[PDB]
Design an enzyme around this catalytic site. Structure first.
Site, PDB file in Angstrom:
ATOM      1  N   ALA B 286       7.478  35.613  28.291  1.00  0.00           N
ATOM      2  CA  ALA B 286       8.784  35.962  28.844  1.00  0.00           C
ATOM      3  C   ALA B 286       9.710  34.771  29.083  1.00  0.00           C
ATOM      4  CB  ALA B 286       8.614  36.761  30.127  1.00  0.00           C
ATOM      5  N   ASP B 332      47.828  15.509   4.121  1.00  0.00           N
ATOM      6  CA  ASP B 332      48.866  15.246   3.143  1.00  0.00           C
ATOM      7  C   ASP B 332      50.113  16.027   3.540  1.00  0.00           C
ATOM      8  OD1 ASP B 332      47.043  13.779   1.431  1.00  0.00           O
ATOM      9  OD2 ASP B 332      46.191  15.739   0.898  1.00  0.00           O
ATOM     10  N   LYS B 493      64.741  10.611 -14.949  1.00  0.00           N
ATOM     11  CA  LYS B 493      64.759  10.960 -13.531  1.00  0.00           C
ATOM     12  C   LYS B 493      63.566  10.311 -12.852  1.00  0.00           C
ATOM     13  CE  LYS B 493      62.397  15.307 -12.685  1.00  0.00           C
ATOM     14  NZ  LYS B 493      61.283  15.510 -13.655  1.00  0.00           N
ATOM     15  N   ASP B 605      56.437  10.213  -0.261  1.00  0.00           N
ATOM     16  CA  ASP B 605      57.779   9.796   0.127  1.00  0.00           C
ATOM     17  C   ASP B 605      57.851   8.296   0.317  1.00  0.00           C
ATOM     18  OD1 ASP B 605      59.970  11.788   0.535  1.00  0.00           O
ATOM     19  OD2 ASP B 605      58.390  12.830   1.688  1.00  0.00           O
ATOM     20  N   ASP B 681      42.872  17.403  -2.860  1.00  0.00           N
ATOM     21  CA  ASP B 681      42.946  18.520  -3.804  1.00  0.00           C
ATOM     22  C   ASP B 681      42.698  18.144  -5.265  1.00  0.00           C
ATOM     23  OD1 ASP B 681      45.306  17.254  -4.477  1.00  0.00           O
ATOM     24  OD2 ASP B 681      46.536  19.083  -4.379  1.00  0.00           O
ATOM     25  N   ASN B 684      40.760  12.959  -8.027  1.00  0.00           N
ATOM     26  CA  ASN B 684      40.844  11.632  -7.410  1.00  0.00           C
ATOM     27  C   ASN B 684      40.394  11.579  -5.953  1.00  0.00           C
ATOM     28  OD1 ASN B 684      41.795  10.069  -9.631  1.00  0.00           O
ATOM     29  ND2 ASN B 684      43.881  10.835  -9.296  1.00  0.00           N
ATOM     30  N   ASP B 685      40.646  12.647  -5.206  1.00  0.00           N
ATOM     31  CA  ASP B 685      40.277  12.686  -3.801  1.00  0.00           C
ATOM     32  C   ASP B 685      38.795  13.002  -3.589  1.00  0.00           C
ATOM     33  OD1 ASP B 685      43.274  12.718  -2.869  1.00  0.00           O
ATOM     34  OD2 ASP B 685      43.056  14.446  -4.202  1.00  0.00           O
ATOM     35  N   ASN B 774      12.687  41.278  30.600  1.00  0.00           N
ATOM     36  CA  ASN B 774      12.808  40.327  29.503  1.00  0.00           C
ATOM     37  C   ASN B 774      13.199  40.986  28.180  1.00  0.00           C
ATOM     38  OD1 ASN B 774      11.215  37.955  27.600  1.00  0.00           O
ATOM     39  ND2 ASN B 774      12.399  37.317  29.397  1.00  0.00           N
ATOM     40  N   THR B 777      17.368  42.353  29.374  1.00  0.00           N
ATOM     41  CA  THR B 777      18.305  41.233  29.469  1.00  0.00           C
ATOM     42  C   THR B 777      18.563  40.598  28.105  1.00  0.00           C
ATOM     43  OG1 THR B 777      16.549  39.691  30.151  1.00  0.00           O
ATOM     44  CG2 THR B 777      17.850  40.728  31.888  1.00  0.00           C
TER      45      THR B 777
END
Ligand code: K
Lengths: 30, 970
Positions: B286, B332, B493, B605, B681, B684-685, B774, B777
């Protein structure tokens, strides 16, 4: 109605199993 | 097909009768699936077997053969004592085995969130189909590309890339990526490494793209063969629980035998030791928990399930323990902190240049989605883009320097991105601008999507594309005027900082003007103004090479020499892009402060803008000094190792970093014992997500990144991480909640019995009764605590330390303080029935101790009945108190420290249910008459129930004193 649903199904099964446990000591009577 | 490598592509195709250009027919797929089975290892197929599992324990078997040698001695209440014990323990097994199998199933089912996928070409559809690898068949054509996990054993039919690099490490050991080819490898014996025309199930595509035919699936694959011959590690918390597992187990086992020896010559009263043995072994059943408690895995399964339903798919389980302890989050920006819902909202071109004088034509674009629905405004008044000659050329550059398009989804109703987010946002701008005044007002939504773009495309032929490279940070396209002679042109660009230097002239309308230092500075003035302003715009500068080199003076496959071909440029304009922070991010950032978790933004950035966004989201303060807390990858690389390490201690912002910078950052963070969650993601990571404590992969990200991480954000949201860390902390609390309740109650059972022996009092509880409490409970209120809501202040304290012990000193005291009182309150209720109750009392001096001398030694110092000691009424006070105090103690475990006046009993509406359901079962063995003979007779309807309650209830009060100490100490 997701975790609360898997809640009754849990407790009620644990209650049902103890209920039968008694009604086997209650059955074994002579 | 078993020898596919040695045989030709033609031979393989022929063998399966499959068209390379088509793939298998839905019929072939069906028959092949029948023939070869699903691409998977078989599921090794509990219930009845799991019940008898519990009786393998020797202490449970000792009890049953002590209840048999008690029955057989009697035959040649105690008549059906082995009948009840067996019936309780088969029920006690099912209660804690079915709970276990359910938890494991719910954890196993987490895998459905991240199913193994594959890409097949099949006869029924022209496009590539992304089905579950599970359903891939030997014979069908598969597609694999950079970031893919090869879904089965594949013979390469054609490499669509210039090179195909495969990471075979998982199968061969070769940790450098192998090059691949189409030619047959003639040796039938040749080992996997020599099989250079083969793709192996379970391996990754490190770069490139291949098309091939599946040769073997299931257990027939190379890694499938390994995983049959394949036949291990405990998480820090498990080791601290198992260690405490013995600690607790070996203390109770000592007290169990000490109960047998304290009863010295009491073996004689009615050979006779077998009673004091089975009453000391029933305590060993018990109070001692053999095998991990079922409610532990029940609340972990429930935790991870909640996490998945919050978009946090747990890949590695132990990462739930790591999750509590996390101290740093490296997120990220573009996908995860910000929505990636991109749109050009500002743009400028050169207006008037006179020596050191330079003015601009600024414009703003309304409409912020991907739809070609908005106005170009100048000074808040709408203008027609087409009137400005610079704007024509700006729009031409944005149309051609573009690998995207738009797409009107008809059933969803909204315009949708095709290429990249940044480029779609450029397509959309060319649509809104309509520099050539095309009739678009009568076009259908579908035909509208690219109308203005496709007009520019019919003005010059796109010859080739100089693709983006991190070094120059720009891409360009070579063009010749369609049909009919204005010379060939290039359109560039890229990052403003980079391309503006490579400009030698500026376009003013249709005029070219020599690029001066005042013009250069003026351009960057606004570029800075925009990236630092209210909306932290990501600017791009658009330029043309008016006189491009000869078509055969440029190496079109060597990436590094591209920048050379992008000089002698003419500045034309700039487009300022908007990609707004996700709304919850602001607040999730704030949560992390309160949690004590540092957050480091990694960005593409430029530094200035990178800092500004950190100010916006709350990583930094609006005024806060930042100079030594934000670095670019370049600046970071020019610091000595030690300063680099120091920098990592305080830095919250890293702009423009190499792929190799994430592993470095993790490493340095680790030298300060930080627990760091890294997002990734790409292929490379992968190494960096491996190095971090919690590798978090993007859902939208590559398979490789996910395969190398502990957790995948389904919705790529940064807030999903914070939510996950909370669910981690919320779980750990819910463990210790149930752990307190289990450990204190068992100490109650030990204090209860060891007082009966070591004082001398009559039997407090019979083995049939002890095994009943026992079971009730551990069956109702215990299993209900796995369902109580996440604790209250979990996210307001600092992050758990991994060097901390599972159960502290103070907590071990709370387990004793309660564990003592519960044990004393049951033995002080059965003894109360004699001493001070009105049902035949023992002497309030102290005579009840010497119950042993009455049946023969009546004439000495007694003068009463000598058979009302085994009375059926003190034991029904000891049982009733124990149940009620256990229902009372269960309310103490709805929170570790928070009082019931701040977290009411109805916080867990289900525990209250299990209280009533436990009370119904307790009242059934007091009233329904076949049973109370085998147990005991009822407690006096109203008078003795008030005593039970005034005995039990104070246990709630006792913990409140301990909780007040606890809360008013931290
Ligand atoms: K890891």
């Amino acid at each position: 109605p997701q975790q609360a649903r898997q809640n009754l199904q849990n407790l009620f099964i644990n209650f049902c199993l103890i209920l039968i446990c008694l009604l086997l000591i209650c059955i074994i009577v002579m | 097909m078993e020898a596919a490598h040695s045989k030709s592509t033609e031979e393989c195709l022929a063998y399966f009768g499959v068209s390379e250009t088509t793939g298998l027919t839905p019929d072939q797929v069906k028959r092949h699936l029948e023939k070869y089975g699903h691409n998977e290892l078989p599921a090794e197929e509990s219930l009845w077997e799991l019940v008898i599992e519990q009786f393998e324990d020797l202490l449970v078997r000792i009890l049953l053969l002590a209840a048999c040698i008690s029955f057989v001695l009697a035959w040649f209440t105690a008549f059906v004592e082995p009948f009840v014990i067996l019936l309780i323990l088969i029920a006690n097994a099912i209660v804690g085995v079915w709970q276990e199998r359910n938890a494991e199933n719910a954890i196993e089912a987490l895998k459905e969130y991240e199913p193994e996928m594959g890409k097949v070409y099949r006869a029924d559809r022209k496009s590539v189909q992304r089905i579950k690898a599970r359903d891939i068949v030997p014979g069908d054509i598969v597609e694999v590309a950079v970031g893919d996990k090869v879904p089965a054993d594949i013979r390469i039919l054609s490499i669509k890339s210039t090179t195909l690099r495969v990471d075979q490490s998982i199968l061969t050991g070769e940790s450098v990526s192998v090059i691949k080819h189409t030619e047959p490898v003639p040796d039938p014996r040749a080992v996997n490494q020599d099989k250079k025309n083969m793709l192996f199930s379970g391996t990754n595509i490190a770069a490139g793209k291949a098309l091939g035919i599946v040769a073997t699936t299931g257990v027939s694959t190379e890694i499938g063969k390994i995983r049959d011959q394949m036949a291990q590690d405990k998480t820090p918390l498990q080791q601290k629980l198992d260690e405490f597992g013995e600690q607790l187990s070996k203390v109770i086992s000592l007290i169990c035998v000490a109960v047998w020896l304290i009863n010295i010559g009491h073996f004689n009263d009615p050979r006779g030791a077998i009673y004091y043995f089975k009453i000391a072994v029933a305590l060993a059943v018990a109070a001692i928990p053999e095998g991990l408690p079922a409610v532990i895995t029940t609340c972990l399964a429930l935790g991870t399930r909640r996490m998945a339903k919050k978009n946090a798919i747990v890949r590695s389980l132990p990462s739930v323990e790591t999750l509590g302890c996390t101290s740093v989050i490296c997120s990220d920006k573009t996908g995860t902190l910000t929505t990636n819902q991109m749109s050009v909202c500002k743009m400028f071109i050169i207006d008037k240049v006179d020596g050191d004088f330079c003015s601009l034509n600024e414009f703003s674009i309304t409409g912020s989605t991907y739809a070609p629905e908005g106005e170009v405004l100048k000074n808040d008044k709408p203008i027609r883009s087409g009137q400005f000659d610079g704007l024509v050329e700006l729009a031409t550059i944005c149309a051609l320097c573009n690998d995207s398009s738009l797409d009107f989804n008809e059933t969803k109703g909204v315009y949708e991105k095709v290429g990249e987010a940044t480029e779609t946002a450029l397509t959309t701008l060319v649509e809104k601008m309509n520099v050539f005044n095309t009739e678009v007002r009568n076009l259908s939504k579908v035909e509208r999507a690219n109308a203005c773009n496709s007009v520019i495309r019919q003005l010059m032929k796109k010859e080739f594309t100089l693709e983006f490279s991190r070094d120059r940070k720009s891409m360009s396209v070579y063009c010749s005027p369609a049909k009919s002679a204005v010379g060939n042109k290039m359109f560039v660009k890229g990052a403003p900082e980079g391309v503006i230097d490579r400009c030698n002239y500026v376009r003013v309308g249709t005029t070219r003007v020599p690029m001066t230092g005042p013009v250069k500075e003026k351009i960057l003035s606004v570029i800075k103004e925009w990236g630092t302003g209210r909306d932290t715009l990501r600017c791009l500068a658009l330029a043309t090479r008016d006189t491009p080199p000869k078509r055969e003076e440029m190496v079109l496959d060597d990436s590094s020499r591209f920048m050379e071909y992008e000089t002698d440029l003419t500045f034309v304009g700039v487009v300022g892009m908007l990609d707004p922070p996700r709304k919850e991010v602001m607040g999730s950032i704030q949560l992390c402060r309160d949690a004590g978790i540092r957050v480091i933004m990694i960005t593409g950035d430029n530094k200035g803008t990178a800092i500004a966004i950190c100010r916006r989201i709350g990583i930094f303060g609006e005024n806060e000094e930042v100079a030594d807390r934000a670095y670019t990858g370049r600046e970071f690389d020019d610091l000595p190792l030690a300063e680099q390490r120091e920098a990592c201690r305080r830095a919250c912002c890293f702009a423009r970093v190499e792929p190799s910078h994430k592993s470095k950052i993790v490493e340095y963070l680790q030298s300060y014992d930080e627990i760091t969650a890294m997002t990734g993601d790409g292929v490379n990571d992968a190494p960096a997500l491996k190095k971090a404590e919690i590798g978090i992969a993007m859902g939208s990200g590559t398979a490789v990144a996910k395969t190398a991480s502990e957790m995948v954000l389904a919705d790529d949201n940064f807030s999903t991480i914070v939510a996950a860390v909370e669910e981690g902390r919320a779980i750990y609390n819910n463990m210790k909640q149930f752990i307190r309740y289990l450990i204190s109650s068992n100490v109650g059972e030990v204090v209860c019995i060891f007082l009966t022996a070591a004082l001398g009092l009559p039997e407090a509880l019979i083995p049939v009764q002890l095994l009943w409490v026992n079971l009730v409970t551990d069956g109702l209120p215990a299993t209900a605590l796995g369902f109580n809501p996440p604790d209250l202040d979990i996210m307001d304290r600092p992050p758990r330390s991994p060097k901390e012990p599972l159960i502290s000193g103070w907590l071990f005291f709370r387990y004793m303080a309660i564990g003592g009182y519960v044990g004393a309150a049951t033995v002080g209720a059965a003894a109360w029935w004699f001493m001070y109750a009105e049902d035949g009392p023992g002497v309030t001096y102290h005579q009840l101790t010497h119950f042993m001398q009455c049946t023969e030694d009546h004439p000495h110092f007694e003068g009463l009945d000598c058979e009302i000691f085994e009375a059926p009424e003190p034991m029904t006070m000891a049982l009733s108190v124990l149940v009620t105090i256990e229902m009372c103690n269960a309310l103490n475990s709805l929170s570790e420290n928070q009082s019931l006046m701040r977290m009411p009993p109805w916080v867990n509406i289900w525990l209250l249910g299990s209280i009533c359901l436990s009370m119904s079962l307790h009242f059934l063995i007091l009233y329904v008459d076949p049973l109370p003979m085998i147990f005991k007779l009822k407690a006096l309807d109203l008078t003795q129930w008030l005593m039970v309650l005034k005995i039990s209830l104070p246990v709630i009060g006792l913990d409140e004193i301990l909780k007040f100490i606890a809360r008013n100490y931290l």
